[PDB]
């Protein structure tokens with residue numbers, strides 16, 4: 276499974292969003308062919324979707 280580092284924090288205020296802080300390493304559960312889409316991941320015991328541009332694939 277791909278991992279990615281958060282370049283910026285995401286508050287993830289909407290239901291289904293995955294919040295994270297800058298520097299967190301997110302486990303990617305689903306990605307698309309664009310890093311401008313919302314991808315699916317998990318970190319900190321939460322699961323959800325987030326803007327893929329906020330992360331850098333390891």
Ligand SMILES: [Cl-]
Pocket residue numbers: 284285286287
């Ligand atoms: Cl935000």
Ligand SMILES: [Cl-]
Pocket residue numbers: 308309310311
């Ligand atoms: Cl892209």
Ligand SMILES: [Cl-]
Pocket residue numbers: 320321322323
């Ligand atoms: Cl969750």
